[PDB]
Amino acid sequence: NENLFASFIAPTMMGLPIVTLIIMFPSLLFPTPKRLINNRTISIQQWLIQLTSKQM
Amino acid sequence: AEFLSLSKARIEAYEKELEKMKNIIPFDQMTIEDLNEVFPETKLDKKKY
């Protein structure tokens, strides 16, 4: 009888706030450049696609 | 002399092509359309790989 765990009883809530903002938001994390050489933060997004476009 | 007649313009057109080829390379970070002359683009579903 050394280490007694505890618990807390509380409702676990998957509520539904305003969704159509939250859906659009991980689009603006990815930009798209109209340039030949890019700016070393799109350039590791652009490489990550050219891997898994070569497996599907 | 038809080779000296016809290919003389083919020499100068190739000589003028060496002038514009110097123009295109430019700065390292130059353009996404000026590099779209030598390296090609095509219509839908050309590049297989």
Short mmCIF file of N, CA and C in Angstrom, two decimals:
data_model
loop_
_atom_site.label_atom_id
_atom_site.label_comp_id
_atom_site.label_asym_id
_atom_site.label_seq_id
_atom_site.Cartn_x
_atom_site.Cartn_y
_atom_site.Cartn_z
N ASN A 1 0.83 -1.20 0.00
CA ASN A 1 0.00 0.00 0.00
C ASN A 1 0.87 1.26 0.00
N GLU A 2 1.74 1.38 -1.01
CA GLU A 2 2.69 2.48 -1.07
C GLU A 2 2.19 3.60 -1.97
N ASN A 3 1.96 3.28 -3.24
CA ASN A 3 1.66 4.26 -4.27
C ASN A 3 0.21 4.10 -4.70
N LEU A 4 -0.65 4.95 -4.16
CA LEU A 4 -2.06 4.94 -4.49
C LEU A 4 -2.30 5.92 -5.63
N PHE A 5 -2.67 5.39 -6.80
CA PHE A 5 -3.12 6.22 -7.90
C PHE A 5 -4.41 6.92 -7.52
N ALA A 6 -4.69 8.04 -8.18
CA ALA A 6 -5.96 8.73 -8.04
C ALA A 6 -6.62 8.82 -9.40
N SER A 7 -7.86 9.29 -9.42
CA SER A 7 -8.56 9.60 -10.65
C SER A 7 -9.41 10.84 -10.42
N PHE A 8 -9.76 11.52 -11.50
CA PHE A 8 -10.71 12.62 -11.46
C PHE A 8 -11.84 12.30 -12.42
N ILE A 9 -13.07 12.54 -11.98
CA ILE A 9 -14.26 12.29 -12.77
C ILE A 9 -14.70 13.61 -13.39
N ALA A 10 -14.57 13.71 -14.71
CA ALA A 10 -14.91 14.93 -15.41
C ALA A 10 -15.34 14.57 -16.82
N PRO A 11 -16.34 15.27 -17.37
CA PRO A 11 -16.79 14.94 -18.73
C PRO A 11 -15.76 15.35 -19.77
N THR A 12 -15.55 14.46 -20.73
CA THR A 12 -14.59 14.65 -21.81
C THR A 12 -15.33 15.13 -23.04
N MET A 13 -15.12 16.39 -23.42
CA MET A 13 -16.04 17.12 -24.27
C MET A 13 -15.47 17.33 -25.67
N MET A 14 -16.04 16.64 -26.64
CA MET A 14 -15.84 16.94 -28.05
C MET A 14 -16.93 17.91 -28.48
N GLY A 15 -16.82 19.16 -28.07
CA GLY A 15 -17.81 20.16 -28.44
C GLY A 15 -17.77 20.54 -29.90
N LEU A 16 -18.65 21.43 -30.33
CA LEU A 16 -18.60 21.76 -31.75
C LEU A 16 -18.60 23.27 -31.92
N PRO A 17 -17.46 23.94 -31.77
CA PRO A 17 -17.39 25.37 -32.09
C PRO A 17 -17.35 25.61 -33.59
N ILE A 18 -17.13 26.87 -33.96
CA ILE A 18 -17.29 27.35 -35.34
C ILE A 18 -16.24 26.72 -36.24
N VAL A 19 -16.68 25.79 -37.08
CA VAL A 19 -15.78 24.88 -37.78
C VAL A 19 -15.23 25.44 -39.08
N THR A 20 -15.98 26.27 -39.79
CA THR A 20 -15.57 26.62 -41.15
C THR A 20 -14.42 27.61 -41.17
N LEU A 21 -14.02 28.12 -40.01
CA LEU A 21 -12.73 28.78 -39.88
C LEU A 21 -11.63 27.76 -39.67
N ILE A 22 -11.92 26.72 -38.89
CA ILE A 22 -10.88 25.79 -38.48
C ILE A 22 -10.49 24.88 -39.63
N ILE A 23 -11.41 24.66 -40.57
CA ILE A 23 -11.09 23.86 -41.74
C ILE A 23 -10.16 24.62 -42.67
N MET A 24 -10.42 25.92 -42.87
CA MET A 24 -9.66 26.69 -43.84
C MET A 24 -8.24 26.97 -43.35
N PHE A 25 -8.00 26.84 -42.05
CA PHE A 25 -6.74 27.32 -41.48
C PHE A 25 -5.52 26.49 -41.87
N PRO A 26 -5.56 25.14 -41.93
CA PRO A 26 -4.38 24.45 -42.49
C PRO A 26 -4.28 24.49 -44.01
N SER A 27 -4.93 25.44 -44.68
CA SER A 27 -4.54 25.72 -46.05
C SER A 27 -3.49 26.81 -46.10
N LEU A 28 -3.59 27.79 -45.21
CA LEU A 28 -2.69 28.93 -45.26
C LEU A 28 -1.37 28.65 -44.56
N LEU A 29 -1.17 27.43 -44.06
CA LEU A 29 0.16 27.04 -43.59
C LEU A 29 1.07 26.70 -44.76
N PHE A 30 0.49 26.38 -45.91
CA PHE A 30 1.29 26.02 -47.06
C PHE A 30 1.18 27.12 -48.11
N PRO A 31 2.26 27.80 -48.43
CA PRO A 31 2.23 28.79 -49.50
C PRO A 31 2.67 28.18 -50.82
N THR A 32 2.52 28.95 -51.89
CA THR A 32 2.94 28.53 -53.21
C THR A 32 3.69 29.64 -53.95
N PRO A 33 4.92 29.39 -54.36
CA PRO A 33 5.71 30.49 -54.94
C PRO A 33 5.67 30.50 -56.45
N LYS A 34 5.62 31.71 -57.00
CA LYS A 34 5.74 31.94 -58.44
C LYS A 34 7.15 32.34 -58.82
N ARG A 35 8.14 31.54 -58.43
CA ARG A 35 9.54 31.86 -58.66
C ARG A 35 10.30 30.58 -58.97
N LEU A 36 11.50 30.72 -59.52
CA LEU A 36 12.25 29.52 -59.86
C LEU A 36 12.93 28.95 -58.62
N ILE A 37 13.85 29.68 -58.04
CA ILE A 37 14.40 29.28 -56.76
C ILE A 37 13.46 29.79 -55.67
N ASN A 38 13.20 28.95 -54.68
CA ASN A 38 12.30 29.34 -53.62
C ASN A 38 13.06 29.61 -52.33
N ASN A 39 12.34 29.73 -51.23
CA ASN A 39 12.80 30.45 -50.06
C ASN A 39 12.95 29.56 -48.85
N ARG A 40 13.46 28.34 -49.05
CA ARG A 40 13.98 27.41 -48.03
C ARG A 40 13.01 27.10 -46.89
N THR A 41 11.72 27.40 -47.04
CA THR A 41 10.68 26.83 -46.18
C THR A 41 9.54 26.27 -47.00
N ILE A 42 9.33 26.74 -48.22
CA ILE A 42 8.52 25.99 -49.17
C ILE A 42 9.34 24.88 -49.78
N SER A 43 10.66 25.06 -49.84
CA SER A 43 11.51 24.12 -50.58
C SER A 43 11.62 22.77 -49.89
N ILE A 44 11.30 22.69 -48.60
CA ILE A 44 11.22 21.38 -47.98
C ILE A 44 9.79 20.90 -47.89
N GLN A 45 8.83 21.74 -48.28
CA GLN A 45 7.49 21.22 -48.55
C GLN A 45 7.42 20.69 -49.97
N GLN A 46 8.11 21.34 -50.90
CA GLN A 46 8.08 20.94 -52.30
C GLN A 46 8.83 19.64 -52.53
N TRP A 47 9.81 19.35 -51.68
CA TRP A 47 10.53 18.09 -51.80
C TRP A 47 9.72 16.95 -51.21
N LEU A 48 8.91 17.25 -50.20
CA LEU A 48 8.20 16.21 -49.46
C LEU A 48 7.07 15.63 -50.30
N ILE A 49 6.59 16.40 -51.27
CA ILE A 49 5.57 15.91 -52.19
C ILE A 49 6.21 15.04 -53.26
N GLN A 50 7.40 15.42 -53.73
CA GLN A 50 8.00 14.69 -54.84
C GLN A 50 8.56 13.34 -54.41
N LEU A 51 8.60 13.07 -53.10
CA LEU A 51 8.72 11.68 -52.66
C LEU A 51 7.43 10.92 -52.87
N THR A 52 6.37 11.31 -52.15
CA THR A 52 5.19 10.45 -52.09
C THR A 52 4.25 10.70 -53.25
N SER A 53 4.69 11.46 -54.25
CA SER A 53 4.04 11.37 -55.55
C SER A 53 4.68 10.29 -56.39
N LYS A 54 5.82 9.76 -55.95
CA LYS A 54 6.46 8.69 -56.70
C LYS A 54 6.18 7.33 -56.08
N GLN A 55 5.12 7.22 -55.27
CA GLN A 55 4.73 5.91 -54.77
C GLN A 55 3.25 5.63 -55.02
N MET A 56 2.45 6.68 -55.17
CA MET A 56 1.09 6.50 -55.67
C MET A 56 1.05 6.69 -57.18
N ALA B 1 26.75 26.55 -104.69
CA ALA B 1 26.75 27.71 -103.80
C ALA B 1 25.45 27.82 -103.03
N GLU B 2 24.56 26.83 -103.18
CA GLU B 2 23.29 26.85 -102.45
C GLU B 2 23.51 26.61 -100.96
N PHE B 3 24.55 25.86 -100.60
CA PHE B 3 24.96 25.78 -99.21
C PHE B 3 25.51 27.12 -98.73
N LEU B 4 26.21 27.84 -99.61
CA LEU B 4 26.70 29.17 -99.26
C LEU B 4 25.57 30.20 -99.30
N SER B 5 24.44 29.85 -99.92
CA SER B 5 23.31 30.77 -99.95
C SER B 5 22.34 30.51 -98.79
N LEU B 6 21.95 29.24 -98.60
CA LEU B 6 20.88 28.94 -97.65
C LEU B 6 21.39 28.84 -96.22
N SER B 7 22.56 28.22 -96.03
CA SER B 7 23.04 27.98 -94.67
C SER B 7 23.74 29.20 -94.09
N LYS B 8 23.88 30.26 -94.88
CA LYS B 8 24.46 31.50 -94.36
C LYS B 8 23.51 32.18 -93.39
N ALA B 9 22.21 32.16 -93.69
CA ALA B 9 21.22 32.64 -92.74
C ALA B 9 21.09 31.67 -91.57
N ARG B 10 21.33 30.38 -91.81
CA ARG B 10 21.30 29.40 -90.73
C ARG B 10 22.49 29.57 -89.79
N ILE B 11 23.58 30.15 -90.29
CA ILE B 11 24.72 30.46 -89.43
C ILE B 11 24.41 31.66 -88.55
N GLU B 12 23.81 32.71 -89.13
CA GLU B 12 23.54 33.92 -88.37
C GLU B 12 22.37 33.74 -87.41
N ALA B 13 21.41 32.88 -87.76
CA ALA B 13 20.33 32.56 -86.83
C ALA B 13 20.84 31.73 -85.66
N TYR B 14 21.83 30.87 -85.91
CA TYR B 14 22.49 30.17 -84.82
C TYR B 14 23.40 31.11 -84.05
N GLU B 15 23.99 32.10 -84.74
CA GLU B 15 24.81 33.09 -84.05
C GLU B 15 23.96 34.03 -83.21
N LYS B 16 22.75 34.35 -83.69
CA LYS B 16 21.84 35.18 -82.90
C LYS B 16 21.22 34.37 -81.77
N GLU B 17 21.18 33.04 -81.91
CA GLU B 17 20.68 32.19 -80.84
C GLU B 17 21.67 32.14 -79.68
N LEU B 18 22.96 32.34 -79.96
CA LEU B 18 23.95 32.39 -78.89
C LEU B 18 23.89 33.72 -78.15
N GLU B 19 23.31 34.74 -78.78
CA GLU B 19 23.14 36.03 -78.11
C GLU B 19 22.00 35.98 -77.10
N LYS B 20 20.87 35.39 -77.49
CA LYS B 20 19.72 35.33 -76.59
C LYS B 20 19.92 34.28 -75.50
N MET B 21 20.78 33.28 -75.76
CA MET B 21 21.04 32.26 -74.75
C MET B 21 21.86 32.81 -73.59
N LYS B 22 22.65 33.86 -73.85
CA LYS B 22 23.32 34.55 -72.76
C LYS B 22 22.32 35.33 -71.91
N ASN B 23 21.30 35.89 -72.56
CA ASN B 23 20.28 36.68 -71.88
C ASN B 23 19.40 35.92 -70.88
N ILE B 24 19.01 34.70 -71.24
CA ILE B 24 18.13 33.88 -70.40
C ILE B 24 18.62 33.44 -69.02
N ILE B 25 19.88 33.03 -68.91
CA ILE B 25 20.41 32.54 -67.63
C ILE B 25 20.44 33.54 -66.47
N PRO B 26 20.89 34.76 -66.74
CA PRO B 26 20.67 35.93 -65.87
C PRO B 26 21.09 35.67 -64.42
N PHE B 27 20.23 36.07 -63.48
CA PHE B 27 20.48 35.86 -62.05
C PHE B 27 20.09 34.44 -61.66
N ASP B 28 20.67 33.93 -60.58
CA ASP B 28 20.32 32.59 -60.14
C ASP B 28 18.83 32.47 -59.86
N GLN B 29 18.27 33.47 -59.18
CA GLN B 29 16.88 33.45 -58.73
C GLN B 29 15.95 34.20 -59.67
N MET B 30 16.14 34.05 -60.99
CA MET B 30 15.63 35.04 -61.93
C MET B 30 14.12 34.95 -62.13
N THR B 31 13.63 33.87 -62.73
CA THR B 31 12.27 33.91 -63.25
C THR B 31 11.73 32.50 -63.41
N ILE B 32 10.40 32.38 -63.37
CA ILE B 32 9.78 31.07 -63.52
C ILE B 32 9.18 30.92 -64.91
N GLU B 33 9.27 31.97 -65.73
CA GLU B 33 8.78 31.88 -67.10
C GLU B 33 9.91 32.04 -68.11
N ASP B 34 10.96 32.77 -67.74
CA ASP B 34 12.11 32.90 -68.63
C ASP B 34 12.92 31.61 -68.66
N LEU B 35 12.84 30.82 -67.58
CA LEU B 35 13.41 29.48 -67.61
C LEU B 35 12.45 28.50 -68.26
N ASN B 36 11.26 28.98 -68.64
CA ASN B 36 10.29 28.11 -69.30
C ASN B 36 10.38 28.24 -70.82
N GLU B 37 11.56 28.52 -71.35
CA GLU B 37 11.76 28.44 -72.79
C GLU B 37 12.60 27.23 -73.17
N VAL B 38 13.76 27.06 -72.52
CA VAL B 38 14.64 25.94 -72.84
C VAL B 38 14.06 24.64 -72.32
N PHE B 39 13.95 24.52 -71.00
CA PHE B 39 13.26 23.39 -70.38
C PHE B 39 11.78 23.47 -70.69
N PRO B 40 11.18 22.37 -71.06
CA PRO B 40 9.88 22.46 -71.73
C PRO B 40 8.67 22.34 -70.82
N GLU B 41 7.52 22.73 -71.36
CA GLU B 41 6.23 22.39 -70.80
C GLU B 41 5.35 21.91 -71.95
N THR B 42 4.24 21.27 -71.61
CA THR B 42 3.43 20.64 -72.65
C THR B 42 1.96 20.73 -72.26
N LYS B 43 1.13 19.93 -72.93
CA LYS B 43 -0.29 19.85 -72.62
C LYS B 43 -0.53 18.82 -71.53
N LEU B 44 -1.80 18.50 -71.27
CA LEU B 44 -2.19 17.59 -70.19
C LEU B 44 -1.68 16.19 -70.50
N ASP B 45 -1.10 15.56 -69.47
CA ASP B 45 -0.65 14.17 -69.48
C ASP B 45 0.43 13.93 -70.53
N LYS B 46 1.52 14.67 -70.40
CA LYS B 46 2.69 14.37 -71.22
C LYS B 46 3.78 13.67 -70.42
N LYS B 47 4.20 14.26 -69.30
CA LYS B 47 5.27 13.70 -68.47
C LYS B 47 4.74 12.47 -67.76
N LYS B 48 5.15 11.29 -68.24
CA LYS B 48 4.68 10.04 -67.66
C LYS B 48 5.23 9.84 -66.25
N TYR B 49 6.54 9.86 -66.10
CA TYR B 49 7.15 9.71 -64.79
C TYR B 49 7.05 11.02 -64.01
#
